[PDB]
C-alpha cells in the first residue's frame, strides 16, 4: 500500500545524448500528449496512497508517467529515441494492465495512445 521511490530521472554516469529525434519527443510527442484534456492522471507517479489503490505497486513493477517522461527529456537522461518511446509504451501497458477494458482512466490512456502512435509514425530520420 505505500508508494515507492519514483522512477530514476538523473544519473550522471548513464552516458546521454540529445538528438534531433530525442528532440522531437520533447517539442511534439510529450508536449501534445502534455497538453491534452486527458493528460492529468498521466503527469505525475501514480499515487497509490492518495489514489487508494494498495494494489497498485504490487501488480506495476515498472511504473511510469509522464512527468518522469518529461524530466527525462528536459535532463538529457536518455541515449536514444528507442528508451524514450518504451517509456510510453511501459505507461500506456501498466494502465492496461492494471485496470478494467472500459475504464474512464483506460479510454483516457488509448485517446493519448492514439495520438503517440500517430506522431511517432513520423519521428523523423536521425541527422
Ligand atoms: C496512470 C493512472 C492514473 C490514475 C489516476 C486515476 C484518477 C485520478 C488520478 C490518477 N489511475 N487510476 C487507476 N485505477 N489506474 C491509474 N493509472
Same mark, same amino acid.
Given at each position: 500500500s505505500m508508494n515507492p521511490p519514483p522512477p530514476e530521472t538523473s544519473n550522471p554516469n548513464k552516458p546521454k545524448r540529445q538528438t534531433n529525434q530525442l528532440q522531437y519527443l520533447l517539442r511534439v510527442v510529450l508536449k501534445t500528449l502534455w497538453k491534452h484534456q486527458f493528460a492529468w492522471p498521466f @503527469? @505525475? #507517479?501514480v499515487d497509490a496512497v492518495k489514489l487508494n489503490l494498495p494494489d497498485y505497486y504490487? /501488480? /506495476? &513493477? %515498472? #511504473?511510469?508517467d509522464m512527468? %518522469? /517522461? &518529461? &524530466?527525462?527529456?528536459? +535532463? +538529457?537522461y536518455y541515449w536514444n529515441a528507442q528508451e524514450c518511446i518504451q517509456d510510453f509504451n511501459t505507461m500506456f501497458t501498466n494502465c492496461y494492465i492494471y485496470n478494467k477494458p472500459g475504464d474512464d482512466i483506460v479510454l483516457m490512456a488509448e485517446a493519448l495512445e492514439k495520438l503517440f502512435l500517430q506522431k511517432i509514425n513520423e519521428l523523423p530520420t536521425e541527422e
Open positions: @503527469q @505525475q #507517479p504490487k /501488480i /506495476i &513493477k %515498472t #511504473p511510469m512527468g %518522469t /517522461i &518529461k &524530466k527525462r527529456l528536459e +535532463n +538529457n
